[PDB]
């Protein structure tokens, strides 16, 4: 179990003004720290956020959070379930800001909701320094789905934070799971919903990316193949070639026209990963992987995801780090989740 701690700085809040927080289990012999960002879509205006508040309240408030969570997958402490970092200090950061971890706006007298995802990450890092993060050698910022996009948006800022707080020896890395999306044509739009949300949230993006696209176009930095080339921290990219959330925003739910659409989507995703040296991209129709119990089951070209992450650690013979399937249809890889 990971144990819940609400933030001591109570000005850093979930959407409804309740304090944000994090679930913690320490490993007191270890200098590795894993900080995982939860996913769960987003909301982009008053009416859309009101609907989320009625049926997805735990993603907008801490008032009903349980006091513990079980660590699973890469947050598991058991070597058989987690061959990669079973001995690490484990942190689960709940997603309660509905802003793809990009917001920096408080609830005030003209804002019904607070959108503080970017400040929540940085406040968690500050408060962990006094619980042993100050002696860390590696901080891996990981995340799934919207949390995976949040890794891309925040990994460099965490490295900047620690560099200016006096900790230049902590190596900050990112692990982005299922957050690598394409702004492609639909089969029958997500791009304003993001452009509209950024305005609603006062959302922020990495600097080098923001300076490339400039004002009014920062929505581009939410797409992995556009923001990743601007990043300075090492980032490992895990991405199903046929991600379920991608097909959803593409209005896909088999005749020739759909067949060609699905094959073209797989080919384009493969192309955007050509120059990403650390990546794992199986030809499956699925969604998320790193915190699920059977995450050691999938293999690409004979190598599992926990092995590929270990090989990434060594890189920073027979221990590859760039694993992208080349077959063009969902589940042509026999190890796909069933």
Ligand X SMILES: *[C@@H]1O[C@H](CO)[C@@H](O)[C@H](O)[C@H]1NC(C)=O
- Sign (positive or negative) of CA dihedral 49, 55, 58, 59: negative
| The one segment of 72-80, 144-152, 268-276, 329-337 that binds ligand T9W by CB under 6 A | 144-152
Contacted by 9, from ligand T9W, ligand X, none: CB < 5 to 8 Å by type:
ligand X
Known catalytic membership, residue 145: yes
* Helix-helix angle 146-164:117-129, to 10 degrees: 50
**Which region among 72-80, 130-138, 145-153, 313-321 touches ligand T9W (by CB under 6 A)?**
145-153
Task: Note whether 203 binds ligand T9W by CB under 6 A.
Answer: no
Q: Which among 167, 35, 151 is positioned nearest to 102, based on CA atoms?
A: 151
* Dist CA 205 CA 155 (whole Å): 11
100 makes contact, choosing from ligand X, ligand T9W, none, with CB < 5 to 8 Å by partner type, with ligand T9W
Under the binding rule (CB under 6 A), the answer on residue 170 touching ligand X is no
What is the size of the binding site for ligand X (CB under 6 A)? 5
Which range touches ligand X (CB under 6 A), out of 4-12, 84-92, 183-191, 263-271?
Answer: 4-12
Query: Which of ligand T9W, ligand X, none binds 119 (CB below 5-8 Å, type-dependent)?
Result: ligand X
Give 154's contacts (C-beta < 8 A, 6+ positions apart): 37, 101, 118, 121, 141
d(CA 314, CA 304): 16
Residue 143 and residue 152: Cα distance in Å, rounded? Answer: 9
Region binding ligand X by CB under 6 A among candidate stretches 5-13, 78-86, 219-227, 272-280: 5-13
Q: Could you tell me the smallest distance in angstroms from the CB atom of residue 123 to ligand X?
A: 6
Asked whether 237 and 274 are in contact (CB, 8 A), the reply is no
d(CA 234, CA 226): 16
Q: Under the criterion CB under 6 A, does residue 145 sit at the interface with ligand T9W?
A: yes
149, 65 in Cβ contact below 8 A?
no
Q: From CA 111, how far away is CA 93, in angstroms rounded?
A: 24
Among 1, 11, 51, 271, binds ligand X (CB under 6 A): 11
Where does this chain bind ligand X (CB under 6 A)?
A: 9, 11-12, 119, 123
Which residues are annotated as catalytic? Answer: 145, 243, 287
Where does this chain bind ligand T9W (CB under 6 A)?
A: 39-42, 100, 145-146, 149, 181, 190, 194, 222-223, 245, 249
């Amino acid at each position: 179990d990971l144990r819940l701690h609400l933030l001591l700085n109570t000005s850093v809040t979930c959407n409804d003004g309740s304090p944000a927080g994090y679930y913690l289990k320490e490993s007191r012999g270890s200098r590795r720290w894993l900080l995982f960002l939860e996913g769960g879509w987003y909301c982009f205006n008053r009416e859309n956020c009101d609907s989320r508040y009625d049926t997805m309240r735990r993603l907008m408030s801490s008032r009903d959070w349980p006091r513990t969570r079980t660590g699973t997958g890469i947050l598991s402490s058991q070597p058989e379930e987690n061959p990669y970092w079973w001995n690490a200090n484990m942190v689960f950061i709940p997603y309660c800001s509905s802003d793809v971890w990009s917001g920096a706006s408080s609830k005030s007298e003209k804002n019904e909701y607070a959108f503080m995802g970017a400040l929540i990450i940085q406040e968690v890092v500050r408060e962990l320094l006094g619980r042993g993060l100050s002696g860390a050698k590696v901080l891996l910022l990981a995340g799934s789905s919207a949390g995976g996009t949040g890794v891309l948006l925040n990994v460099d800022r965490v490295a900047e934070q620690l560099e200016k707080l006096g900790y230049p020896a902590i190596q900050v890395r990112g692990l982005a799971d299922s957050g690598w999306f394409l702004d492609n044509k639909q089969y029958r739009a997500p791009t304003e919903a993001i452009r509209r949300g950024i305005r609603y949230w006062n959302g922020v993006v990495p600097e080098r990316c923001r300076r490339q696209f400039q004002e009014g176009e920062e929505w581009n930095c939410f797409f992995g193949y556009k923001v990743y080339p601007t990043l300075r921290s090492p980032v490992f990219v895990v991405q199903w070639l046929f991600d379920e959330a991608q097909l959803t925003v593409d209005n896909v739910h088999v005749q020739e026209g759909l067949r060609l659409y699905i094959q073209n989507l797989g080919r384009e995703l493969r192309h955007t990963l050509k120059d990403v040296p650390a990546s794992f991209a199986p030809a499956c129709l699925s969604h998320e992987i790193i915190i699920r119990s059977h995450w050691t089951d999938v293999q690409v070209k004979g190598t599992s995801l926990p092995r590929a992450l270990h090989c990434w650690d060594r890189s920073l013979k027979g221990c590859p780090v760039h694993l992208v399937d080349s077959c063009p249809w969902p589940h042509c890889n026999p190890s796909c989740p069933t």
